Amino acid sequence: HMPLVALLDGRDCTVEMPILKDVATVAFCDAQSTQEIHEKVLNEAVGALMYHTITLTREDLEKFKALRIIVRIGSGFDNIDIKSAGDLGIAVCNVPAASVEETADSTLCHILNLYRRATWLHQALREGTRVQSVEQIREVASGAARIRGETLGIIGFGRTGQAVALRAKAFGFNVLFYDPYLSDGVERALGLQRVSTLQDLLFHSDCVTLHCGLNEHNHHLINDFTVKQMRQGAFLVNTARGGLVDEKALAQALKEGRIRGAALDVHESEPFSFSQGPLKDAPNLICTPHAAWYSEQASIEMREEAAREIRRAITGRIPDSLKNCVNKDHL
Amino acid sequence: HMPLVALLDGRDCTVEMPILKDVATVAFCDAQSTQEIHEKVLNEAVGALMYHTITLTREDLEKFKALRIIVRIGSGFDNIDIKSAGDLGIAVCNVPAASVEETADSTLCHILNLYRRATWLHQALREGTRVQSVEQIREVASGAARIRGETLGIIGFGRTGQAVALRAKAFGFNVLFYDPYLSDGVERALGLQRVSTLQDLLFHSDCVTLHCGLNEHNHHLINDFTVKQMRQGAFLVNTARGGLVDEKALAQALKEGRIRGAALDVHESEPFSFSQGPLKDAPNLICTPHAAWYSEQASIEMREEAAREIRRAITGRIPDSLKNCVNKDHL
Amino acid sequence: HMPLVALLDGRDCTVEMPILKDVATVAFCDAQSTQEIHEKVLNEAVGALMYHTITLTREDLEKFKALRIIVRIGSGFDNIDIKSAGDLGIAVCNVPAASVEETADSTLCHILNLYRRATWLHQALREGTRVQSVEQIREVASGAARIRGETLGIIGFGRTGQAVALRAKAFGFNVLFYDPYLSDGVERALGLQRVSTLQDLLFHSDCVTLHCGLNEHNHHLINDFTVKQMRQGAFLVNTARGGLVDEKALAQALKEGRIRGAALDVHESEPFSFSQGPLKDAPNLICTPHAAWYSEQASIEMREEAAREIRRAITGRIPDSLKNCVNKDHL
Amino acid sequence: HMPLVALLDGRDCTVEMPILKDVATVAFCDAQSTQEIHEKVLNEAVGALMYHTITLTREDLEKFKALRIIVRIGSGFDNIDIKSAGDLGIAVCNVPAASVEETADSTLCHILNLYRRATWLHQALREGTRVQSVEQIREVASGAARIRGETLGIIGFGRTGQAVALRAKAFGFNVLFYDPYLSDGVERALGLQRVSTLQDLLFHSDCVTLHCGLNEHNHHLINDFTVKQMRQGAFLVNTARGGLVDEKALAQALKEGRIRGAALDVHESEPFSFSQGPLKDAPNLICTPHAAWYSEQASIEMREEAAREIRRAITGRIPDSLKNCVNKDHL
Ligand SMILES: Nc1ncnc2c1ncn2[C@@H]1O[C@H](COP(=O)(O)O)[C@@H](O)[C@H]1O
Ligand SMILES: Nc1ncnc2c1ncn2[C@@H]1O[C@H](COP(=O)(O)O)[C@@H](O)[C@H]1O
Ligand SMILES: Nc1ncnc2c1ncn2[C@@H]1O[C@H](COP(=O)(O)O)[C@@H](O)[C@H]1O
Ligand SMILES: Nc1ncnc2c1ncn2[C@@H]1O[C@H](COP(=O)(O)O)[C@@H](O)[C@H]1O
Ligand SMILES: [Ca+2]
Ligand SMILES: [Ca+2]
Ligand SMILES: [Ca+2]
Ligand SMILES: [Ca+2]
């Protein structure tokens, strides 16, 4: 009788089971919350696989009586109290590399959608707008702007942020980044300008894109205060984490025109709806349902890697055998 | 009393008049056809400014009794019989450089919109789709594909085509082009692979993008025959000219899935409508109303350049003074 | 009995003969001048292969009594009177693509050799210089300069020039070019700045590199006059043609320090010697013996292509069958 | 009376003193070894500035009776026992960013010097070689190779390594790297392939370039064993640290042709001489006297930064105030 591993917030384990067949019994819960988890898993689950639709607090984690590893199928782990998980003796891991370029591609797509208004232009044709003269073109496409010379400010200069920068350079962007945790000179290897503070980044950027994890020190990084530091008519793009932005502040900025447009793949409350929330009636808003990460090859890659990480934890020694443990310090 | 210059298919001459004030009387016609042009212009117009919403055949041009220059405010001139215009002693000019990067940016936006489905994903949220689980994400975003390793086939390797290639390289595309008029070795300077025939390009390309003018030899370049030469599930993008594609052929390819998606800024009949035409009910279609060229700075640049070209023709010697005459041979 | 083809200024025909065996008798002359060509070739040679070490004037070409094609094994043809050759009914062809990237790589090597002084630094160690302290390093390497922010001015924006630009961009150069024959907007497709005149290019460039053919209108393009228009302490690089530079002017500029250094793969009189010529005692000079074009694969590629061009001329119709005829107008 | 700071292995403190004037007395020793340091500095020196020409062992550091900070004017600190320095309560710092791009430029210069033989070709002309025929060009330039398609293997994917990769991509290199300390996915952000082991890197690379620090685990990383794992006729470039290569092994590889050429800015014993050492008579060797880092702007930048770091240590709290302390763990 092998250890039990549970896919907490999902139903499909097809990609994982060929890797774990002779290692662990695999069950799933399709649970949005811990309340919806059968007590068989809580008391006996040795490992857990998990996406982004369930959050595990210290109280949620204290209900598990035998869990020793949690593997987030994906890069971000802000939905898990990793320090409490470490206190309780539970290793938390992630899969960081699978969707780096997918997300950067989705990001560039949203950046170009703002500067070129292709998505809004398509809606206008879906809604029946007639664009016959060169002069109706200019009106319907009003706001489309030349990209060369514009300044793109990247918050978070890690893997995805650097992929964004590389792509942005080819379109003629002047690319800056702000990352207060990187060592001196990372800007030089890649031929970019770096700034010391968020205020400087927002001050100089016509378009601000977010590419940092959500941690204890940057909740609502974009807030009513820091939004006033953004250039008039600036763009905001967020394919990182919804909790990084105060949507109430953003909603007002868009309504008053202080921000000309925003493209958001993530939101404070998901799933997102154009009928519920602070952006209920905000203008110049493009939204995708947390899909910037998804490609068929990326989805398979991350699930196979996560399954292997579970295998390494069961058959090996924690945390030495793990390749992407994110709470070694708290463990 | 100065020579008369007429903005044929438009109303706004504000950008042009400061340049032409002391050179020519400036009138406009706001005419979609030659039938709608007041006979005062036909008999006395010495020069003409024109966009893409009116076509001038040999018969249309023979109605002008004093015209000696036509300046297309824009790069393409397929809407003017340039060889007959030259026969009749009328120089035809264009403005090629103003929207090179704007169009390449719109093109990359449409390419990424197909590979990432951001525009379709936004529609699904506008239509009320609920995307709660990781598993509804995969379904709603089904078709989104990893770009690295994919092959982008560029038809037409001129200014816009080369800007497309440069940008595409940064996303990991394998970029080929087909241009049967360029000299030997242009592929080498830019680090790209070139193919000899359209069939080869379509054979190897997962995504085909068009960046050639519409001339007498490539009407319906993409037709029922050449569409069968495209890879199964390939992408098509067209920000060049609508006449290059047989939409009846494309409509069927999209319906049967031989082409997974198409992004079109231009169409056989403009203005485009999702309710009229061969693509009335075609799936996986993204459309923009011939706006890939438009930025505020590009629109001003092209109009000022065209006004200067008109000035050079009136005050100087034709065709020696013109900087962008496109029918010197037929003149 | 087949037509005779002669390798005029060489001995080795090994690469060409498998292609021409059943098409033409192949002889060689190893001749630096026409005076050294056996009269059998002059009177009967139907085709000719040729490198850069022999020049054919109208008088040289009038000695051939049956020649109908000349194929330059290489890109440049300034050593052939192509217009007189056309008058006499002789097609002249070249092979332009084989060494585009080789030359751009040699160019970047010479550019970096000037900015980094690696070649001069190696000489100093060959001559026995002792570099022990950080302070002898600065002295021996005195002149080495930071590249980011420097301006590279490209004269000639064709295949090699554009390959130079692409590479130069990655090192942080600000790249301009001057090419008075290209159409409007070529700078935009590639994300570069263009200037109208040679004076402007030389005015703004810290390092000037030449990548244009030698034609009737740019002999001694760099002369005593235009050298005074160069920035103080500027760099000059020439991998194009020696006839483009007045070496007497350059020698003085280097001696007086108006030019800090020059890297030359070509020269007014070849073969080059550090003991003969106007640069006999010029300082800060790096020289290579007209080898910027050479790689093993490039040398084979060009010779096979040239052999095929000869084959096409003998077995087909001139000039219709030729792929790289450079005097179709004069023919 | 202020604290004393000593430039140990140098004489020039001009750039540093305006920053330290009112903070510390500044003396210099111009010492290649600790034996040559006046005892006034040993007993009273509170801080130390230092380049790469003196090494400080535990025994050297134990002679200082009041030293509390050492600042290496430069990136590498392999010449300082940092762990013993930390044991003795001495913070060790460096200046990492000043010469990132200078070194990458020197590296690319040496890489191109090998592939293009420009430096060797210039020597041949200095030695009087006559290169008249196309056929003497091929012989004298024999070995010059086409770069597109070649594989560049980077050992060490930090700041300089990544700058090397970016530049190398533009020349057509296929760039791999090996860095066993970086997290999963760094290769993806930058569009490169990564390998797990040194053997794999050496196996696939036509040209191997070193860009890692010298630490306790990679002395003689390139040794007689690992040299046999290099591809036949491969290139080696080293602008990092001389101690990374067994020159006896390299000397033999070059003599037998297993390595076609090597470009070395650093060496096991410096200063380097072509008359002393294991490479006394090694062929196909290019050498520079540890100058890859030097530009005028880089030299000033690093000295001002180091002076500021000394100022921060004297006027602030160690190690909290330091911006580039490299032994916080051992302190
Ligand atoms: N508040 C913040 N502001 C800017 N950058 C941040 C912040 N928090 C984290 N980061 C950076 O975001 C990056 C995440 O990269 P990755 O997780 O590899 O995509 C890291 O370089 C972090 O240092
Ligand atoms: N039928 C065709 N197929 C491929 N390329 C074409 C065709 N017709 C024209 N072109 C090319 O399209 C390019 C137009 O570039 P531009 O007008 O500068 O954007 C030129 O390089 C033409 O040679
Ligand atoms: N005097 C000149 N100044 C600047 N560019 C020139 C000059 N003469 C020729 N060229 C350009 O040099 C380029 C040669 O390119 P290629 O022969 O393809 O390497 C062409 O673009 C020419 O227009
Ligand atoms: N033995 C080694 N093999 C490969 N990479 C190494 C080795 N030792 C250190 N490195 C890497 O070298 C890089 C140094 O970068 P930097 O000091 O920023 O130029 C870091 O990424 C290290 O992980
Ligand atoms: Ca703006
Ligand atoms: Ca596909
Ligand atoms: Ca200078
Ligand atoms: Ca080789």
Author numbering:
A (entry chain A), B (entry chain A), C (entry chain A), D (entry chain A): 26 to 356
From the paper:
CtBP1 and CtBP2 regulate cellular processes through binding transcription factors and recruiting chromatin remodeling enzymes such as histone deacetylases, methyl transferases, and demethylases to targeted promoters. Although assembly of CtBP has primarily been considered in terms of dimers, there is accumulating evidence that NAD(H) binding triggers the assembly of two CtBP dimers to form tetrameric dimers of dimers.
Five residues with different amino acid identity between CtBP1 and CtBP2 have atoms within 5 Å of NADH. For each of the five, we mutated the CtBP1 residue to that in CtBP2 to determine the contribution of each to the distinct AMP responses. One particularly interesting mutant, V185T, enhanced tetramerization in the presence of AMP. This ordered water molecule stabilizes a cluster of water molecules in the vicinity of bound AMP, which apparently stabilizes bound AMP over that in wild-type CtBP1. Our results also highlighted another important sequence variation, Thr 191 in CtBP2, which is occupied by the isosteric, but nonpolar, Val 185 in the homologous position in CtBP1.
